[PDB]
Design a protein around this ligand. Structure first.
Ligand SMILES: *[C@](O)(C(=O)NCc1ccccc1)[C@H](C[C@@H]1CCNC1=O)NC(=O)[C@H](Cc1ccccc1)NC(=O)/C=C/c1ccccc1
Length: 180
């Protein structure tokens, strides 16, 4: 109930639809001109954000202290408007919750919300041939076009949807320290 209300407002204020050469994704703006996509979106020097061409000043593919994939890319966008600052909604470590909502904002899934149920710290996953850490898992059959979806509970932005095996979905935990 509260989590859906939270999700809808978060998506209205901070999310957008992006197209790269690799597809269409939900994008979440974090603060200032820094946003996040799934790594596999592979943003080039320009992206389409709500159909408008926007320059990418800088792009950072995140890894842990061993070089292990986190499956997030951080993007600094060449634009006047600043994102509302949502770092206070990001945890310091992986959040487990009993009820979460996954929010999608593309041309395909416009303004769609999915109650995924329980979110568990899955940790390690071999994600399409790549060893990947800090995965959050939910037992909903997510499908192609949901990448970049934003995983939320009431007052919490938990992670970004980056993959699925047809039966379970996985989110990269969105941690506060990535945005210091
Ligand atoms: C998203 O990337 C996605 O929704 N992409 C847009 C898209 C639209 C149309 C066609 C194809 C893609 C995708 C979400 C998955 C797909 C099935 N269910 C989901 O929730 N994610 C992937 O395709 C990722 C891509 C990837 C991740 C990391 C590095 C490089 C690429 N791959 C997987 O989820 C693979 C999973 C897997 C599981 C078991 C065994 C082998 C592979």
């Amino acid at each position: 109930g509260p989590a859906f209300e939270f999700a809808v407002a978060m998506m209205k204020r901070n999310s957008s639809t992006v197209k790269t050469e690799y597809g269409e994704f939900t994008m979440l703006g974090i603060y200032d001109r820094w946003a996040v996509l799934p790594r596999h979106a592979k943003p080039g020097p320009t992206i389409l954000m709500n159909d408008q061409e926007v320059g990418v000043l800088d792009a950072k593919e995140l890894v842990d202290k061993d070089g292990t994939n986190l499956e997030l890319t951080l993007l600094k966008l060449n634009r006047n408007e600043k994102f509302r600052d949502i770092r206070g909604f990001l945890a310091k470590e992986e959040v487990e919750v009993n009820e979460a909502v996954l929010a999608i904002n593309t041309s395909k899934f416009p303004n769609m919300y999915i109650p995924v149920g329980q979110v568990t710290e899955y940790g390690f996953l071999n994600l399409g041939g790549t060893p990947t850490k800090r995965m959050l898992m939910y037992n909903f059959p997510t499908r192609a076009g949901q990448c970049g979806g934003v995983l939320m509970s009431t007052g919490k932005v938990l992670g970004i949807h980056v993959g699925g095996n047809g039966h379970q979905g996985f989110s990269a935990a969105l941690l506060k320290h990535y945005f210091n």
